[PDB]
Design a protein around this ligand. Structure first.
Ligand SMILES: Cc1cc2nc3c(=O)[nH]c(=O)nc-3n(C[C@H](O)[C@H](O)[C@H](O)COP(=O)(O)O)c2cc1C
Ligand SMILES: O=C(O)c1cccc(NS(=O)(=O)c2cccnc2Nc2ccc(Cl)cc2Cl)c1
Ligand code: SF4
Length: 354
């Protein structure tokens, strides 16, 4: 008993309009770097009618630095090669060999260096939607002016941030966000109604709930609270089509006690698997830190990486390249609930049937 792409699926979930774009199911696959949500994952998610989201961070690592001009110590040299336009273009092109013209997003952290350049690169590569968190992105329209149809979606954690972003954008660009993703840094079941309420002032911008959403019962709860859709990362992290192939080996064995919150050179906490570089640091076998890729502004070219003990660009790139000893591995809080690695098709069927 296997459901295939030529079979029908009956859903009571309704299509979701984001700006000029429509997705069949009110579900975003959350962007995941480095190299977790590239062409295979994002293309297959979009093929199924959810929003596939390509992570635009660290694209220089794609296919072992296929598209970088300069390499240093096996790393992309500087932001121009770490956020590689040519790699981003090929990732989008390969996604669309799978999903065609179905909508695709690009996720870009606001804290990266060359943020505006990577936003414009994402539009030029074919992104229909830009998603940005890790900051308060008050100038997203500045870099998208040449791409009127690309929808812009900040990630926020409060109704105050919604009101601020809508006012700043409206006053400066005569435009407001096309959607908001709401995530806790405070429980999601109390944040969503507050943000939904605040959006009323600005025209019922769709609100996408994110964080800890696992199954259709969680989706239904979120829609009942006024959310227009959900964003899910960890569930897709555990699919076969994930572009970082180590996770299919790592998640099935992952126990709750091995998930932990850590500091980062970006100045935002991350949730990591207690393995790889995190174990190397505690042994006193930490990899050398010497900023090559210059990934994020808050680090100041290695100042903060040296303080917290690891380089996030180096560690996340090593994981994409298959490095179990020195890679950095992330997970949502529900990562320990992954037992089987299933297909994207199987997952979407589970989340949408009925
Ligand atoms: C492996 C991994 C990589 C991530 N990378 C990004 C990223 O590049 N950009 C971003 O906005 N969020 C990133 N996140 C956060 C997720 O997009 C998402 O907000 C959070 O994990 C979703 O909650 P869930 O995993 O509970 O569904 C990442 C999460 C994981 C697990
Ligand atoms: O909520 C959770 O459980 C959760 C679990 C894991 C990650 C996140 N958020 S995060 O955006 O990924 C993130 C946070 C903190 C520092 N860095 C980050 N990302 C990042 C930075 C630089 C590069 Cl070069 C690449 C990437 Cl991916 C949330
Ligand atoms: S040293 Fe800091 S800015 Fe440089 S690549 Fe590493 S985390 Fe990024």
């Amino acid at each position: 008993e296997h459901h295939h792409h030529h079979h029908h699926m009956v859903s009571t979930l309704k299509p979701l309009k984001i700006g000029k774009h429509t997705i069949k199911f009110p579900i975003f696959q959350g962007g995941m770097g480095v190299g977790i949500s590239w062409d295979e994952l994002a293309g297959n998610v979009a093929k199924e009618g959810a929003l596939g989201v390509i992570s635009a961070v660290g694209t220089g690592y794609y296919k072992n630095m296929r598209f970088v001009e300069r390499i240093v110590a096996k790393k992309p040299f500087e932001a121009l090669n770490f956020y590689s336009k040519k790699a981003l273009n090929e990732i989008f092109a390969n996604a669309r060999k799978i999903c065609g013209n179905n909508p695709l997003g690009a996720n870009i952290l606001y804290a990266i260096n060359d943020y505006g350049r990577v936003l414009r690169d994402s539009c030029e590569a074919g992104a229909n939607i830009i998603i940005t968190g890790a900051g308060l992105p008050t100038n997203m329209p500045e870099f998208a002016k040449d791409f009127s149809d690309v929808a812009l979606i900040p990630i926020i954690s409060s109704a105050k941030a919604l009101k601020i972003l809508c006012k700043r954008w409206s006053d400066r660009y005569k435009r407001i966000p096309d959607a908001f993703i709401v995530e806790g840094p405070f429980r999601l079941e109390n944040l969503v109604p507050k943000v939904v309420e605040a959006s009323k002032e600005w025209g019922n911008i769709p609100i996408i709930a994110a964080g800890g959403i696992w199954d259709r019962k969680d989706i239904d709860t979120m829609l009942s609270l006024g959310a227009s859709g959900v964003q899910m990362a960890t569930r897709f992290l555990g699919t076969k089509e994930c572009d970082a192939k180590v996770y299919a080996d790592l998640l099935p064995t992952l126990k709750k006690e091995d998930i932990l919150l850590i500091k980062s050179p970006v100045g935002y906490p991350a949730r990591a698997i207690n393995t790889g570089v995190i174990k190397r640091i505690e042994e006193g076998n930490a990899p050398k830190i010497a900023c090559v890729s210059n990934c994020v502004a808050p680090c100041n070219r290695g100042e903060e990486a040296k303080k917290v003990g690891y380089c996030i660009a180096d560690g996340l790139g090593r994981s994409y390249l298959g490095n179990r000893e020195e890679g950095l591995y992330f997970t949502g809080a529900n990562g320990y609930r992954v037992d089987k690695i299933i297909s994207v098709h199987e997952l979407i069927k589970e989340l949408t049937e009925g």
